Amino acid sequence: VNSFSGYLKLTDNVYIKNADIVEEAKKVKPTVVVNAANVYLKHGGGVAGALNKATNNAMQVESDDYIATNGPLKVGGSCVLSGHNLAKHCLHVVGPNVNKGEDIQLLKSAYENFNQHEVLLAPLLSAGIFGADPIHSLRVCVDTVRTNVYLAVFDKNLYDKLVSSFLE
Numbered sequence: 066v067n068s069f070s071g072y073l074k075l076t077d078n079v080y081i082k083n084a085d086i087v088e089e090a091k092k093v094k095p096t097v098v099v100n101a102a103n104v105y106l107k108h109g110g111g112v113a114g115a116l117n118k119a120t121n122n123a124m125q126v127e128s129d130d131y132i133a134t135n136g137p138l139k140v141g142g143s144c145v146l147s148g149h150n151l152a153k154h155c156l157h158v159v160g161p162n163v164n165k166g167e168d169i170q171l172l173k174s175a176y177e178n179f180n181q182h183e184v185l186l187a188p189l190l191s192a193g194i195f196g197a198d199p200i201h202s203l204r205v206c207v208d209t210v211r212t213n214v215y216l217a218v219f220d221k222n223l224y225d226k227l228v229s230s231f232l233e
């Protein structure tokens with residue numbers, strides 16, 4: 066149904082809300098939720114752990130089956146797997162992990178994966194355990210994504226800083 070509500074329109078195609086992405090998925094019934102994935106699709110932490118728990122581990126079971134046959138993703142890459150109870154599809158996108166020395170330039174590649182989907186519910190890529198500057202990630206999103214992205218930011222303080230930064 067893609068019933069997004071209460072988002073702040075930043076650009077013609079980028080929207081943001083102070084919300085929990087899992088509760089958004091339940092409310093919106095998006096066609097596509099983006100996962101903040103790693104290359105092995107091991108969803109023990111970060112947004113990936115939240116999404117996987119909300120699928121009662123179905124996302125991890127599917128992901129383990131996928132990796133054993135298909136091999137890992139690349140940093141900056143993506144795959145499309147089931148959305149389970151959260152969405153029709155899950156776009157698993159690997160942003161660079163700058164806490165582990167990966168090149169922040171790959172954040173552009175990461176966001177380019179969104180352009181194959183008309184509308185997405187997504188987290189800010191490379192945030193949290195991936196260590197990138199969230200203000201920078203929002204700029205790369207706005208500069209790179211051409212399709213309609215609805216960003217959910219959990220932490221109110223961080224939301225407020227992102228919106229302030231963007232309106233400067």
Ligand SMILES: Nc1nccc2ccccc12
Pocket residue numbers: 084085086087111112115188189193217218219220
């Ligand atoms: N659950 C959730 N939703 C949106 C953004 C997040 C960022 C980090 C952890 C959880 C998040």
